């Protein structure tokens, strides 16, 4: 409709006076109207970094694509928009940030859906994993403060119920899911802000990813790339040492050159 | 959450 055409353009181009006016007086408007690519007002405002429009839309209840807008904002590193979205009762009241990608794929609430069918990113990619993938240090910190963690993908030869039934079901989603989890674990954004000893964590993770490169021959390049990310993180931390005490901490751990 | 707090609520 003309009201929805006008409303979508106002949100997309940051026409705050029009966006605010329509959300107040209009009683015949569907905030969930989509454009030619199936993007509603929230997804258009987040994509163009319209924080003022984003907060006006989120005040309107029955607004859709809340979960996808957070992932879209995290992907673009819009820190101010992220904390505006993370202040939506879909995230604040619930525990969506804390739950694992597996637990997320058991809810089946289509919260992070960007359209009738599908998600913008892989369903296994949680907000914390996406923030780690994009290496958004401030977004990772914000999600870590909320309790978000990356679950380790288990061993390749894991005979637990979850790893057995996921490999039996698809064996390709499971293979791609563990790469995404390790791609977030191996990010310097998550390595530095999660563990008390990132240098020890990166060294151990570098070995773990190197071994998986041989086991998963077809995704060998993916795992070798992630191993190098942990390899040059500890080199990066060593490069920042400025006196002997800092060097002796990185090299000896907590003079045995451990 | 985070291992290191570089910054108490402000």
């Amino acid at each position, epitope marked *: 409709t003309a009201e929805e055409e006008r409303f979508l353009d106002a949100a997309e181009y940051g026409n705050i006076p029009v966006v605010r006016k329509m959300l107040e007086e209009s009683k015949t408007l569907n905030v969930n109207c989509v454009d030619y690519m199936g993007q509603n007002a929230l997804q258009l405002a987040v994509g163009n970094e319209h924080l003022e429009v984003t*907060e006006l839309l989120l*005040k309107k209840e029955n607004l859709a694509r809340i979960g996808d807008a957070l992932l879209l904002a995290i992907s673009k590193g819009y820190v101010r928009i992220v904390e505006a979205i993370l202040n939506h*009762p879909g995230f*604040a*009241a619930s525990k969506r940030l804390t739950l694992s990608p597996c637990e997320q794929e058991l809810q089946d609430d289509d919260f992070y859906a960007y359209d009738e069918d599908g998600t913008r990113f892989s369903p296994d990619i949680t907000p914390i994993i996406l923030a780690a993938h994009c290496q958004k240090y401030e977004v990772v910190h914000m999600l870590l403060m909320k309790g978000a963690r990356i679950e380790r993908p288990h061993d390749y030869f894991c005979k637990c119920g979850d790893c057995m039934e996921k490999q039996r079901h698809d064996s390709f989603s499971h293979s791609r899911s563990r790469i995404n989890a390790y791609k977030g674990l191996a990010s310097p954004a998550y390595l530095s802000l999660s563990s008390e000893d990132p240098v020890l964590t990166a060294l151990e993770l570098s070995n773990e990813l190197a071994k998986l490169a041989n086991i998963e021959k077809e995704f060998k390049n993916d795992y070798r790339k992630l191993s190098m990310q942990c390899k040059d993180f500890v080199v990066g931390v060593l490069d920042l040492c400025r006196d002997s005490e800092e060097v002796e901490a990185i090299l000896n751990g907590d003079a045995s050159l451990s | 959450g985070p291992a290191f707090m570089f910054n108490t*609520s402000l």
Partner: nanobody
Amino acid sequence: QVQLQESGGGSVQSGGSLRLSCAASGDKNYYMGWFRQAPGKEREGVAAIKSDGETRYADSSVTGRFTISQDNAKKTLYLQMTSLKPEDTAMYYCAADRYIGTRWKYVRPEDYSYWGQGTQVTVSS
């Protein structure tokens, strides 16, 4: 429309202790806060607490002496006031809102849609 009613106010001597209660009727109150309005001035924030319990306090005069808390499950908002001062005499309101945004950490009265009637607190030295 959430219904907020304040209780616990009254007259206390300086340096005393008071506890304000706010009964909330409705479900979309994920953001609540306390606001005071001294006579001759504008309504200003005191504290604000989310559903998950994240709190922020307005200024540093009330920090450490005023504590906001919520049964959450029992739909009640509390303001523990200790070391009362004569300048704390005002009309205290509890406000609720479904969503605030990036401006929540400022405790600004204009961000809250539902308001209680307010209870008068008079601290006498």
